Design a protein around this ligand. Sequence first.
Ligand SMILES: CCCCCC/C=C\C=C/CCCCCCCC(=O)O[C@H](COC(=O)CCCCCCCCCCCCCCC)COP(=O)(O)O[C@@H]1[C@H](OC(=O)CCCCCCCCCCCCCCC)[C@H](O)[C@@H](O)[C@H](O)[C@H]1O[C@H]1O[C@H](CO)[C@@H](O[C@H]2O[C@H](CO)[C@@H](O)[C@H](O)[C@@H]2OP(=O)(O)OCCN)[C@H](O)[C@H]1N
Ligand SMILES: CC(C)CCC[C@@H](C)[C@H]1CC[C@H]2[C@@H]3CC=C4C[C@@H](OC(=O)CCC(=O)O)CC[C@]4(C)[C@H]3CC[C@]12C
Ligand SMILES: CC(C)CCC[C@@H](C)[C@H]1CC[C@H]2[C@@H]3CC=C4C[C@@H](OC(=O)CCC(=O)O)CC[C@]4(C)[C@H]3CC[C@]12C
Ligand SMILES: CC(C)CCC[C@@H](C)[C@H]1CC[C@H]2[C@@H]3CC=C4C[C@@H](OC(=O)CCC(=O)O)CC[C@]4(C)[C@H]3CC[C@]12C
Ligand SMILES: CC(C)CCC[C@@H](C)[C@H]1CC[C@H]2[C@@H]3CC=C4C[C@@H](OC(=O)CCC(=O)O)CC[C@]4(C)[C@H]3CC[C@]12C
Ligand SMILES: CC(C)CCC[C@@H](C)[C@H]1CC[C@H]2[C@@H]3CC=C4C[C@@H](O)CC[C@]4(C)[C@H]3CC[C@]12C
Ligand SMILES: CC(C)CCC[C@@H](C)[C@H]1CC[C@H]2[C@@H]3CC=C4C[C@@H](O)CC[C@]4(C)[C@H]3CC[C@]12C
Ligand SMILES: CC(C)CCC[C@@H](C)[C@H]1CC[C@H]2[C@@H]3CC=C4C[C@@H](O)CC[C@]4(C)[C@H]3CC[C@]12C
Ligand SMILES: CC(C)CCC[C@@H](C)[C@H]1CC[C@H]2[C@@H]3CC=C4C[C@@H](O)CC[C@]4(C)[C@H]3CC[C@]12C
Ligand SMILES: CC(C)CCC[C@@H](C)[C@H]1CC[C@H]2[C@@H]3CC=C4C[C@@H](O)CC[C@]4(C)[C@H]3CC[C@]12C
Lengths: 419, 48, 44, 34
Amino acid sequence: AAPLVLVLVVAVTVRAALFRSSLAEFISERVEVVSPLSSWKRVVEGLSLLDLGVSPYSGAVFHETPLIIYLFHFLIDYAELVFMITDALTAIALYFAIQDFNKVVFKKQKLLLELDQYAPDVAELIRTPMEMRYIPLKVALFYLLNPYTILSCVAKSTCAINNTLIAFFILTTIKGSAFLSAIFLALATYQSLYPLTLFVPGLLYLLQRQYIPVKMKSKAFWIFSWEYAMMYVGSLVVIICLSFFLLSSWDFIPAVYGFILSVPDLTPNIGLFWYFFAEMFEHFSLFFVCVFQINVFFYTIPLAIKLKEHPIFFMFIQIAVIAIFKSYPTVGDVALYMAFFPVWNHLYRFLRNIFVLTCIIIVCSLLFPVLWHLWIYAGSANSNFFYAITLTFNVGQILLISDYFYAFLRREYYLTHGL
Amino acid sequence: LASGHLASAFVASQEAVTSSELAFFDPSLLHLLYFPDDQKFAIYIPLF
Amino acid sequence: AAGAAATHLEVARGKRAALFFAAVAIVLGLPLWWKTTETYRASL
Amino acid sequence: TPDFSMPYNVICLTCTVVAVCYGSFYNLLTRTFH
Ligand SMILES: CCCCCC/C=C\C=C/CCCCCCCC(=O)O[C@H](COC(=O)CCCCCCCCCCCCCCC)COP(=O)(O)O[C@@H]1[C@H](OC(=O)CCCCCCCCCCCCCCC)[C@H](O)[C@@H](O)[C@H](O)[C@H]1O[C@H]1O[C@H](CO)[C@@H](O[C@H]2O[C@H](CO)[C@@H](O)[C@H](O)[C@@H]2OP(=O)(O)OCCN)[C@H](O)[C@H]1N
Ligand SMILES: CC(C)CCC[C@@H](C)[C@H]1CC[C@H]2[C@@H]3CC=C4C[C@@H](OC(=O)CCC(=O)O)CC[C@]4(C)[C@H]3CC[C@]12C
Ligand SMILES: CC(C)CCC[C@@H](C)[C@H]1CC[C@H]2[C@@H]3CC=C4C[C@@H](OC(=O)CCC(=O)O)CC[C@]4(C)[C@H]3CC[C@]12C
Ligand SMILES: CC(C)CCC[C@@H](C)[C@H]1CC[C@H]2[C@@H]3CC=C4C[C@@H](OC(=O)CCC(=O)O)CC[C@]4(C)[C@H]3CC[C@]12C
Ligand SMILES: CC(C)CCC[C@@H](C)[C@H]1CC[C@H]2[C@@H]3CC=C4C[C@@H](OC(=O)CCC(=O)O)CC[C@]4(C)[C@H]3CC[C@]12C
Ligand SMILES: CC(C)CCC[C@@H](C)[C@H]1CC[C@H]2[C@@H]3CC=C4C[C@@H](O)CC[C@]4(C)[C@H]3CC[C@]12C
Ligand SMILES: CC(C)CCC[C@@H](C)[C@H]1CC[C@H]2[C@@H]3CC=C4C[C@@H](O)CC[C@]4(C)[C@H]3CC[C@]12C
Ligand SMILES: CC(C)CCC[C@@H](C)[C@H]1CC[C@H]2[C@@H]3CC=C4C[C@@H](O)CC[C@]4(C)[C@H]3CC[C@]12C
Ligand SMILES: CC(C)CCC[C@@H](C)[C@H]1CC[C@H]2[C@@H]3CC=C4C[C@@H](O)CC[C@]4(C)[C@H]3CC[C@]12C
Ligand SMILES: CC(C)CCC[C@@H](C)[C@H]1CC[C@H]2[C@@H]3CC=C4C[C@@H](O)CC[C@]4(C)[C@H]3CC[C@]12C
C-alpha cells in the first residue's frame, strides 16, 4: 500500500523536476522520442490552422485523430498535468491486473498438483506465495522509472495515451468484462491500426475464464466468439461515424490510416523503413511495402496454435512484435513490453546469453544521440553510422524476445517430463 | 481502291497513316524507362 | 500416461504450424510477386 | 542527403534482419524437445 504511493510520489516528483529545467526543449525534439504521428508541435499547428479557417488535413504536417483535437482543444492550458495523470493511470492498471493474474496462476497450479499430472522430482520449479508477493509493485516501478517513459512524458508525446488505453484493455479483460474490453480495444485500434492483433489473445483468455472448451464441434464457443466480434466491430463503426461530424469531412481517414500504411515521410527513426525506402528501386517499392506490412500481422495464427493455453504470454509476445515492426516506432512503445519482464523472471535459470543482449541494447541507446549530433551538426559523419545503430538495436531486441520464448517452452517441458 | 471509289479510299488511307504513326512514336516506347530483366535475381535472392 | 498424451499433442501442433507456414507462403508470395512485378502488355 | 552509392547493400542488410526474425520464430514454433 505505502510502497505504491511512495513509488507514485517519486515518479511524479522526477517528472515535475524535469519539466522545469533547461533540457525540456532539447528533449522535445529528439527523433527517437517523437514521430510525425506523436509530436506536440503538430497538435498546436493543427489547432492554429483551425483558427485560420483552413482544414487541418489539407496540408502535410498534421496526422492526428479528431478526438485528440477535441481533448486538447479543451485542455491546452493544463497540458503538463494530463501526461502525469495518464502515466499514473497506466501504472495503477498494470498493478491491479498483475495481482489478479497471480491469483489465477497459483490457483491453477495448485489444482494440477492433486490431479498429480506433474513429474515426481519437479520441485524448485513450483511457484510459491512468498515469491509472487512483490511482482505487481515491481511491474509498476519498471514502467514508471524507465528512462524511456520519462523521456516520452517530458516531450508530451501522444504515445502515452495509447499505452494507457492498452493497459486499460488488459485490466478490463483480466477482470472479466467483455463489453469494456471491446470498447477499449476499439479505442486503441482507432488511434493506431496495429492493436487489432490483440483480439485473439483476449478472446482466448475470456473463453478460458468461462470454462468453455475451445473445439470445432462446440456451440458455446461460436456463440461467445460471435458476440465479442460484433461488439468490437460496432464500437469501431460508431467511433468513426462520430468522428465524421466534428469537421463534416472524411479527410482524417487518408491522413491517418493511409499515412500509416503507405509510409510517405522519410524522417529518420529507430525503425527499419526510412533508409530502406530512401534507397529503393522504384520498380519493387509496392512489393516491398506489402511484404513488410504483412510481416506484422503474420505471426498471430501460428502463435495462437502453439500458445493456446497461455494467452498472457501470447499478449506479451504480440506487443513486442508490434513495437519492433511498426512503420513509425518510438521508445514509448518499447517501454510497454519491458514493463512485463518481472512477470517472467522466474524463467531466469533457463535463459542464455541475456548479459550480452542487455549490454548491447544499453550501448545502442547512448549511441543514438552522439551519432545524430555528428551527422547533423558537426558534419563529420553520414547516415550509414545511424543506419548501422538502428540495425544493431533491432537485432538485439529480436534476440532477447526469442530467448524468453525458448525459456518458457523449456520450463514447460521440464514440468511435464521430469527435471 | 479495288472497287474504284477514289475519295473514300483517300480518306481511309489518311486515317490509316495517322493512326499508325500515332502508335509508332508514343513516348512510352522508350526502352530506357524500365528496369533491366537481367538484374532481377539480385533483388529477389536476399529474402527468398 | 500423461507424457504420451503430451508428446502427441505437441507433435500435432507443430505439424499444424508448419502447414500454415507453407500454405501462406505459396498462396500469397507467388500471386503477389507475379502481380506487382509484371510488365503489362496489351493485345495486338 | 542519403548515400547515393549503396542502394543495393541496404536491401540485403534489412532483408537479413527480417530473415533472422523469421528463422527464430519458425524454429521455435515448429520443432519439439527430444
Ligand atoms: C552486433 C550484431 C550486429 C547485427 C548487424 C550489424 C549491423 C550494424 C553493425 C555493424 C555495421 C554493419 C552494417 C554497416 C553498413 C553501413 C555502415 C558503414 O559501414 O558505414 C560506416 C559506418 O561506420 C560504422 O559502421 C561504425 C561506426 C559506429 C557504429 C558502431 C557499429 C555498431 C556498434 C553497436 C555495438 C558496439 C559495442 C556493443 C557491445 C557491448 C561509415 O564509413 P564510410 O561511409 O566511409 O564507408 C562507406 C561504405 O562502407 C561500408 O558500408 C562497408 C560495406 C559492408 C558493410 C557491412 C558489414 C558486413 C558484415 C558486418 C558484420 C556485423 C555483425 C553481423 C553478425 C551478427 C561502403 O564501403 C561504400 O560503398 C560507401 O559509399 C562508403 O561511403 C563513402 O564511400 C565513397 C567513396 O568515398 C563515396 O561515394 C561517392 O564518391 C565516389 C567518388 O569516388 C562516387 O563514385 C560515388 O558515386 C559517390 O557519390 P558522390 O559523387 O561523391 O556524391 C557525393 C554527395 N554527397 C561515399 O560518398 C562515401 N560516403
Ligand atoms: C469455417 C468457416 C466457414 C468459418 C466459419 C465457421 C463455421 C464453419 C462454424 C460456425 C458455426 C459452426 C457450427 C455450430 C454448431 C455446430 C453443432 C455441433 O454439434 C452439436 O452442437 C451437437 C450437440 C450434441 O448433440 O451434443 C457440430 C458442429 C456445428 C455444426 C458447427 C460447425 C462449424 C460452424 C458451421
Ligand atoms: C467500421 C469499419 C469496419 C468499416 C466501416 C466504416 C465506414 C463507416 C467508413 C470507414 C472508411 C470510410 C470510407 C473512407 C474513404 C472514403 C472516400 C471518400 O471519397 C472522397 O470523396 C474523398 C475525397 C473527396 O472528398 O474528394 C468517400 C467516402 C469513403 C468511401 C468512406 C465511406 C465510409 C467508410 C467506408
Ligand atoms: C478492424 C477491422 C474490421 C477494420 C479496421 C479498419 C481498416 C480495415 C480500415 C479503416 C480505415 C481504412 C483506410 C481509410 C483510407 C484509406 C486511404 C485510401 O487511399 C489512399 O489515400 C491510399 C494511400 C496511398 O496510396 O497514398 C487507401 C485505403 C485506406 C488506407 C484505408 C485502408 C483500410 C482502413 C485502414
Ligand atoms: C488484417 C488486415 C489488416 C489484413 C492483413 C494485413 C495485410 C494482408 C494488408 C492489410 C493492409 C495492407 C496495406 C494497406 C495499404 C497499403 C499502402 C499501399 O500504398 C500504395 O499503394 C501507394 C504507393 C506505394 O507506396 O507503393 C501499399 C500496400 C499497403 C502497405 C498494404 C500492404 C498489405 C496490408 C498490410
Ligand atoms: C475514473 C477514470 C478517469 C480513472 C479510473 C482509475 C481508477 C478509479 C480505477 C482504474 C483501475 C481500477 C481497479 C482495477 C481492478 C480492481 C480489482 C477489483 O477486484 C476491485 C476494483 C479494482 C481495485 C479497481 C478500482 C478502481 C481503479 C483503481
Ligand atoms: C467516443 C469514445 C469516448 C467512445 C465511447 C464509447 C463507445 C465505444 C460506445 C458508445 C456506444 C457503444 C455501442 C452501443 C451499442 C452497441 C450494440 C451492441 O450489440 C454491441 C456494442 C455496441 C456497438 C456499442 C459499442 C461501443 C460504443 C460505440
Ligand atoms: C484479408 C487480409 C486479412 C489479408 C489479405 C492481404 C491483403 C490485405 C493485401 C495482400 C496483397 C495486397 C495488394 C498488393 C498490391 C496491390 C496493388 C495496388 O493496387 C495497391 C494495393 C494492392 C491491390 C494490395 C491491396 C491489399 C492486399 C490485397
Ligand atoms: C485465418 C486462417 C484461419 C485462414 C488462412 C488460411 C490458412 C490458415 C489455412 C489454409 C489451409 C489450412 C491447412 C489445411 C490442412 C491442414 C491439415 C490438418 O490436419 C491440420 C490443419 C491444416 C494444416 C490447415 C491449417 C490452416 C491452413 C494453413
Ligand atoms: C515476411 C512475412 C512475415 C510476410 C510475407 C511473407 C511471404 C508471403 C513473402 C516474404 C518474402 C517473399 C519472397 C521474396 C522474393 C521472392 C523472389 C521472387 O522471384 C519470387 C517470389 C519470392 C520467393 C517471394 C515469395 C513470397 C515471400 C516468401
